[PDB]
Chain length 160, copies 3
């Protein structure tokens, strides 16, 4: 139809030795990893929040509590797929997703297509409606010092 | 019709003693509050900027350099100027970033306030909240950030 | 048509002595400037990213290598125009652009209308479809300390 809605999402996680690096469902060879409840997939969290926002359904925290047994130990791709099911049942179809990863290292460009493929699979979208961008923070802040990684997302949906 | 536009907004304010904490028009009990020339409702400022941006009307600094007015009156006036340019608001989405206090119990009230100020049904307004994972000035409780996205149409 | 897409962009550059300060294509008189391989125009880079992301064409680094000697000192308006040409080649028309600059200094209000005119010219848009906003970071973080300048952007396009 013509009942479009937009949503936006943000997420950040600390970057310290000890954990694997998983961004967009992709396990990336690195010395440090992202600290969170589960995989701490900062990119999928931001996209999930953008989708809930576009549907005016709250946020990732109110749908998938860390305490909730039904999502104990679920990984962020499963959360993303459950997010999309709720978006559909509210009557919305996803038109496109765009996103940015901000990280001082490692280089993420080799893994962009893998992330796009995971996200498009999880959302049941054609590949050319999913986009992921990645850049450094020019050595500024806790991002520029490699203490964390941030993700931003935007989503467009339409009531159908 | 089909002349859609998007806008994006961003704001941050310092948390300081002696001021009340007002986010999305909701007074939240807390030892500190937001500093600003206005009442410093950082969430309403981000949404205001996103609405000015979507209508290509400039920004909040150019519209409201209204002395003593609160951020809801300024949001109402923002919505008036967006309508004055010929735009209708289709939806608003937003995020609050604050290490403390807990905002989850106040989200539905903020959403109700924004919908009334923008003359929008509840289901076209969304507010999200999270922490900054103890990173940077937000993670140290020194400020609270808000982000907003708005879709308008010119019919 | 009705095939709408949204994109979002982010950029930051350090503010250093001995560099021109070029934001939105405007050379702003100032003792410091933005540091980058190109002219480091943080606002146009953010808008460029939003446009590539809306068209699902990747990001600015994919399209214009930030290490290639041919882009040393590159005019970021020329990069923006080539971005818009590639977005058009992918079948997309640009409907509007919104953006924000975050800086402690200098005062950008005298220059914002000129930046908007530059972006509108590069995107072949009327002025009423381009918006540039400017604010401080309320004294917080490296932005509050004047160590860099941030830009944010959003773009709506449609596949014809
Ligand atoms: C030629 C040129 O400028 N290329 C760029 N690639 N990435 C950039 S960014 N991270 O500053 O937006 S600029
Ligand atoms: Zn997260
Ligand atoms: Zn403010
Ligand atoms: Zn840049």
């Amino acid at each position: 139809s013509m009942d479009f809605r937009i949503g936006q999402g943000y997420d950040v996680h600390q970057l310290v030795p000890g954990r694997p690096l998983i961004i967009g469902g992709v396990t990336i060879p690195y010395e440090r990893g992202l600290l969170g409840h589960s995989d701490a997939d900062v990119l999928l969290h931001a996209i999930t929040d953008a989708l809930f926002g576009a549907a005016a359904l709250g946020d990732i925290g109110r749908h998938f509590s860390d305490t909730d047994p039904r999502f104990k130990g679920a990984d962020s791709r499963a959360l993303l797929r459950e997010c999309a099911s709720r978006v559909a049942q509210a009557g919305f179809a996803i038109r496109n997703v765009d996103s940015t990863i901000i990280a001082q290292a490692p280089k993420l460009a080799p893994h962009i297509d893998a992330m796009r493929a995971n996200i498009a699979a999880d959302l049941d979208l054609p590949l050319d409606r999913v986009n992921v961008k990645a850049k450094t923070n020019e050595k500024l802040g806790y991002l520029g010092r490699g203490e964390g990684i941030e993700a931003q997302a935007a989503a467009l949906v339409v009531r159908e």
